[PDB]
Amino acid sequence: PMPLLINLIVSLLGFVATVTLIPAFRGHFIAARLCGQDLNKTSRQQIPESQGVISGAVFLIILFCFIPFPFLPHHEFVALIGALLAICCMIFLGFADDVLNLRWRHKLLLPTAASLPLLMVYFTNFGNTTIVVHLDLGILYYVYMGLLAVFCTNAINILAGINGLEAGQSLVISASIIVFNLVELEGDCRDDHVFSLYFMIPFFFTTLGLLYHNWYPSRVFVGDTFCYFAGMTFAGVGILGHFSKTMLLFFMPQVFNFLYSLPQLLHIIPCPRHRIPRLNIKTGKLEMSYSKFKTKSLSFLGTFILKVAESLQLVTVHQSETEDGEFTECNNMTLINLLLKVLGPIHERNLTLLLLLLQILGSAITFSIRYQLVR
């Protein structure tokens, strides 16, 4: 593990670099108007946004320096430069979307745009287009790879709204991939897991440096730049490491949160501006958020999904009648608000930690399935 040693050293220098640079560039983001208030806090102070650009930049420089060490044969090098191009492009287009706030339709095209070098590397390095249930997907396999980048970013991005969640969930996911890579390094696929480690170790330590400042009480915000960055690094290693299926199982709390959010996101059930919990100033803890709307304006499909989700004991429905008419106060559909439905009001630092623990539980479940640990 001669290049893995060098990779671990540069990753630790990168942790120190992220911890040091994030407060150094604070002034620049504030002056750039790249800052906002922490909605779940009584404090009206502006906190710098998109700090995922600094940890993402540190990540790139770390790996740019690392590039000659695995070699010091081009088939594994093409994937290394190719994966770095896809990730770099994503950190770029991610930060551009943060700064410019592009339309949701253009936002979904950005990950497929940046994932193109991985698809081309998989094409030139003759990647297995076949899948095991034995079915050759061919063109539909490249559509999967293209949509994998789009998924991971938005899956992380829609499971957010509380300090240290986005960086924290990514640390559990990247640490799970590190553990999995190490176990599978000993035999069989050594090349596919040594490659994945080369990106996961620097991703873990740069994110650690970011979480140092994002963790409760949030000093900085990670921004959509970090979600874009994280999403592509995970899609990158999963695609070129061929463990995309195993990797998507580490995305279990995200897969649930996405599908539970889907009726609100698609506006089948009314969706407000912010579906984040409401902080009770007297309590100090975070309480559930609600989406009240007219019952007559609601669609037949929307009335069905909301009634099935109520019968499944997932959504709290509160009926009311005013002078304007009859309105339905539906619970905001997200894993954060569902945890407050089940466990009552929870403080922000404990609520994130609980979702991080939930992320650990799912990873243990994945590992137990894959290595026979149920008994």
Swiss-Prot record:
Pathway: Protein modification; protein glycosylation. Its main location: endoplasmic reticulum. Residues 186-190, 242-243 are lumenal. Dolichyl phosphate binds at residues 107, 150-158. The chain crosses the membrane at residues 4-31, 52-71, 74-100, 104-125, 139-158, 165-185, 191-214, 223-241, 244-265, 348-372. Changing residue 2 to I: In a breast cancer sample; somatic mutation. UDP-N-acetylglucosamine--dolichyl-phosphate N-acetylglucosaminephosphotransferase that operates in the biosynthetic pathway of dolichol-linked oligosaccharides, the glycan precursors employed in protein asparagine (N)-glycosylation. The assembly of dolichol-linked oligosaccharides begins on the cytosolic side of the endoplasmic reticulum membrane and finishes in its lumen. The sequential addition of sugars to dolichol pyrophosphate produces dolichol-linked oligosaccharides containing fourteen sugars, including two GlcNAcs, nine mannoses and three glucoses. It is linked to Congenital disorder of glycosylation 1J: A form of congenital disorder of glycosylation, a multisystem disorder caused by a defect in glycoprotein biosynthesis and characterized by under-glycosylated serum glycoproteins. Congenital disorders of glycosylation result in a wide variety of clinical features, such as defects in the nervous system development, psychomotor retardation, dysmorphic features, hypotonia, coagulation disorders, and immunodeficiency. Myasthenic syndrome, congenital, 13: A form of congenital myasthenic syndrome, a group of disorders characterized by failure of neuromuscular transmission, including pre-synaptic, synaptic, and post-synaptic disorders that are not of autoimmune origin. Clinical features are easy fatigability and muscle weakness. CMS13 is characterized by muscle weakness mostly affecting proximal limb muscles, minimal involvement of facial, ocular and bulbar muscles, and tubular aggregates present on muscle biopsy. Symptoms include difficulty walking and frequent falls. This is UDP-N-acetylglucosamine--dolichyl-phosphate N-acetylglucosaminephosphotransferase. It comes from Homo sapiens (Human). The gene is DPAGT1.
